[PDB]
Amino acid sequence: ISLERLDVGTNLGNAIAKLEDAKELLESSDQILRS
Amino acid sequence: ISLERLDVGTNLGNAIAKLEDAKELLESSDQILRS
Amino acid sequence: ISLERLDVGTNLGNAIAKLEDAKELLESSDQILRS
Amino acid sequence: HQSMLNSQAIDNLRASLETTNQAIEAIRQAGQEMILAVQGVQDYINN
Amino acid sequence: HQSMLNSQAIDNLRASLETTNQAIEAIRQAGQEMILAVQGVQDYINN
Amino acid sequence: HQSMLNSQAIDNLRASLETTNQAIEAIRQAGQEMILAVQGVQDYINN
Ligand SMILES: [Ca+2]
Ligand SMILES: [Ca+2]
Ligand SMILES: [Ca+2]
Incomplete structure (x- = not known):
């Protein structure tokens, strides 16, 4: 039987990805600045 | 009778507004950059 | 006897420090821009 | 001519960067409000 | 010469700032997702 | 003259943008710490 569980892992995972x-975009900006 | 309820809606709403x-400020910056 | 307590104060304190x-870095950037 | 165009383009970048810095400050303040919301959830749980 | 180098450097800054603005937008969207996660914790507690 | 002033102003913008990018990185790391705090609240609730 599945018990009720708190899972906000979708939204937290979307935040982690963003x-x-x-x-990666900051690294690209800093690449451009150094050059 | 009002029951006790968790309400962090003020702080979350302030975050949403910010x-x-x-x-809007990013859109203004990007407007300026395109021009 | 210590009772079990929720404490995410370490991570929240790290966020507050960051x-x-x-x-401070934004203030330095804005200093540079005004000058 | 090219030095005038370059001055104008520098003014453009400066305006954009000033605006970008205000956007960042708004996100920084959103972050402070999110920290307060998570502190409020913790306080409700410990009570 | 110096006006050509300055044009090139302005192009560099513009590309960097455009990129920086996309980074900021990604953080802004991360913030929206964090607000949704905290709303989900609140809803679970009130149920 | 104007090309020298423009070089100087470009140096100014570059320094500001580099600084702005460090500010953004600090906010990005604050966001990672907020995600860890919300994960900690979820784990405490599921236990
Ligand atoms: Ca990706
Ligand atoms: Ca508004
Ligand atoms: Ca510090």
Whole structure:
């Protein structure tokens, strides 16, 4: 029997992905600045 | 009778408003960049 | 006897410190822009 | 000519960056409000 | 010469700032998702 | 003259943008810490 569980893992996982997308874009910006 | 309820809607609503303010400022920055 | 307590104060305190670090860096950027 | 165009383009970038910095500040303040909401959830649970 | 180098450097800054603005937008969207997660914790507690 | 002033102003913008990018990174890391706090609230509730 499945018990009721709190799972906000979808929204937290979407936040984690967006913060990784931001990291890659910041690295690209900083690449451009150094050059 | 009012029952005790968790309500962090004030702080969450303030965060939602600030993220909308940020969106409008980013749109203004991107307007300026395109021009 | 210590009772079990929710304490996410470490992560929240780390977030608070990082948002203060961001404020100081934004102030430095805005200093540079005004000059 | 090119130095005038470049001055104008520098003014453009400066205006954009000033605006970008205000956007960042708004997100920073949103973050402070999210920290307060999570603190409020913790306090409700410990009570 | 210096006006050409300055044009090139302006192009560099513009590309960087455009990229920076996309990074900011990603963080802004992460913030919206964090607000939804905290709303989900509140709803689970009130049920 | 104007090309020298424009070089100087470009240096100014570059320094500001580099600084702005560090501010953004700090907010991005604050966001990672907020995600960990919300995960900690969820784990406490599921236990
Ligand atoms: Ca990705
Ligand atoms: Ca508004
Ligand atoms: Ca510090």
